[PDB]
Write a protein that binds this ligand. Structure first.
Ligand SMILES: [Ca+2]
Ligand SMILES: [Ca+2]
Ligand SMILES: [Hg+2]
Ligand SMILES: [Hg+2]
Lengths: 370, 370, 51
């Protein structure tokens, strides 16, 4: 390879698109660049120390990403195969530290648009994997190339890409309104046909005595800032609703309407995130299958057996989904009593059951006693 | 090691990022720096003794942190293994003072962004552990390095990071409004075509007698401060709601809407916090596993046996979650009656049961009598 | 004005301020219909909660 092309690849590379989502996840929004300006003598744009420059950046993106991460990977991934030796080795590798890392990957892939992570044999000779921050990686196209991509989309943009317009707007409005609250304090006086000749007399005479002296037919008008709380609040409300839509998220704010408890009502609530979860699963599995291919290669060469993950091993994702356990249990009891259902299927579908194998077995031993 | 490098490390170290969360936890918010200024002759910015400078700083952060702490660690951590000797040694070490310290760690790791704690052998020769304040620690990279990191995030920022903007805004508004209430008391008079020539005559004549004398066609206008209670109240409302979201907290103010009792309605309520708790658990466990690695090293060398915590020992976190116990007991009863459930599983799922083992046995011995 | 609270005026004059009007209401009213049509025109499902 060449050392000169290396420099081109480095100097042509830019991490500003991939860091975008990371900066928003941290409440470093473009609104932090807001500054309150004014114009000099010959129109020189200048910041002015006179006025407070509030710039509020909202944690919307961090909320949505976290929600997505936890939904897909909060519960550890389960694995099933008929090849038990393989099953053992996979479980040994991937069921505790793996979980905590895969969690960091999904958040990362949602902030960066892509997350790479690299497989490598330890100094002790054991198999290991470390996260390889995509904003340090440069890609152009063991046997195959030695890194594992986890793609967020096909487009490999951050989730932020589809709603950054809204977060920015939300921030813009909030801060504007904040400035208005600050400016409301500083009252501006209009002095019509003022009595005193001295300028000193005014500022002292108002500040230390209640009085402002005025002659002629004049007086004192005050100019106070208007605070646009109402209009701001009205718009913000919409932006807020759209935000959830645009981000395919769930809003479990309490339902004003007295319906939200029912099966369909709940299903509808999660509809969009369920949309967003499925893609992300497809994309996560893609990366993970390739990950177990590499682990299979390691096992072939370390002399621990030759395996085919892509055809032998099956993965199971679990979803933390709000249900109406009371409703389900009844539907199930009706179902079985009706005889449109096996107790087997029923027990597995029962919300208070973790492992259908153990419970199906527990119910039989109960009967053989009673 | 070098003593000059030591100085560099120390002088280059800054604790302000890590003490940020500790200061807000103690209601020393940035708003405490607010001061009511004005401008001199030649534009010198100066604090003015004339006006009261309210600066109210809100306990919001402390509330959320306290809530997180308690949710994760409020109930003591439970340990299970098949190796009973190990299990004994672990319990002896970690079930009373360890609870009270781990609580202080979680609180600390949420204010600081990280917390370190150091294992060390006592003067009496016994195993001991002390908290090692992260703001006094400097890290660059027994066998392994001798300190245990408890990470708040991956980014090792405080939780405050994701909602400090809001807290500040909440403080800013409240204080401004307080100033308004303060200023309202001091009435400012506008004196048009004033009758008296003497300046003395006014301040005494108003102060001791009800009278202000005016000639010409003039009069007395008063200028009173406006108090922005309404607009403030409206904005403060939204911020508050956002605050709860941005922080992944639970707000158990009472529900105007008559739904809040049901299973799903309560699940929705804790949705965000359950999110936040799961990350924090992973991160806590990570630190804790390593802590039990060190305990294992001590045990190996102290001649009390060689163990593998990472594979033998299992940990159990408990969560204090609000439930509808009345509803669950029914569903369970229905489930068992229906035949979709073993009494075993049901007993373990019953909200009035602490130890399933004792109660499954108690019910048997009841039957063998009846 | 920028360093003191004051604007000085003589004669029989004064200071009026012009501030932008924000069309939030009409806009919110219009945006509402467009959103409804959007879902129709696009043959989509709106699973917003049912009032
Ligand atoms: Ca800010
Ligand atoms: Ca204070
Ligand atoms: Hg957008
Ligand atoms: Hg924020």
């Amino acid at each position: 390879p060449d050392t000169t092309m290396i420099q081109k690849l480095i100097d042509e590379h830019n991490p500003e698109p991939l860091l975008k989502g990371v900066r928003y996840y941290m409440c470093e929004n473009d609104i932090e660049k807001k500054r309150r300006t004014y114009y000099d003598a010959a129109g020189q744009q200048l910041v002015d120390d006179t006025k407070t420059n509030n710039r509020t950046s909202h944690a919307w993106h961090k909320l949505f990403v976290d929600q997505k991460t936890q939904y897909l990977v909060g519960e550890p991934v389960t694995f099933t195969s008929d090849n038990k030796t393989l099953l053992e080795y996979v479980n040994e590798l991937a069921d505790d530290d793996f979980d905590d890392i895969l969690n960091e990957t999904v958040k990362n892939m949602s902030n960066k648009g892509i997350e790479y992570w690299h497989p490598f044999v330890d100094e002790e000779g054991e198999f290991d994997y470390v996260i390889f921050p995509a904003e340090e990686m440069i890609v152009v196209y063991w046997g195959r190339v030695p890194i594992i991509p986890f793609k967020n989309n096909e487009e490999m943009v951050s989730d932020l890409k589809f709603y950054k317009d809204l977060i920015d707007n939300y921030d813009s409005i909030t801060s504007s309104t904040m400035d208005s609250f600050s400016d409301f304090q500083q009252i501006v006086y209009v002095l019509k046909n003022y009595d005193g000749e001295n300028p000193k007399e005014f500022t002292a005479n108002l500040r230390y005595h209640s009085v402002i002296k005025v002659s002629g037919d004049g007086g004192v008008d005050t100019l106070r800032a208007e605070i646009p709380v109402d209009s701001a609040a009205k718009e913000l409300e919409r932006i807020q609703d759209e935000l959830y839509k645009s981000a395919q998220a769930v809003d479990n704010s309490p339902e004003t309407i007295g319906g939200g408890a029912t099966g369909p009502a709940l299903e509808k609530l999660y509809a969009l995130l369920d949309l967003k979860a499925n893609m992300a699963e497809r994309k996560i599995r893609a990366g993970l299958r390739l990950f177990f291919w590499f682990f299979a290669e390691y096992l072939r060469n370390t002399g621990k057996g030759d395996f085919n993950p892509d055809k032998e091993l099956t993965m199971t994702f679990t979803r933390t989904r709000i249900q109406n356990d009371s409703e389900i249990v009844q539907s199930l009891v009706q179902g079985v009593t009706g005889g449109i259902m096996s107790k087997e299927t029923a027990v597995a579908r029962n919300p208070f059951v973790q492992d259908p194998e153990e419970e199906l077995a527990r119910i039989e031993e109960e009967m053989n006693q009673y």
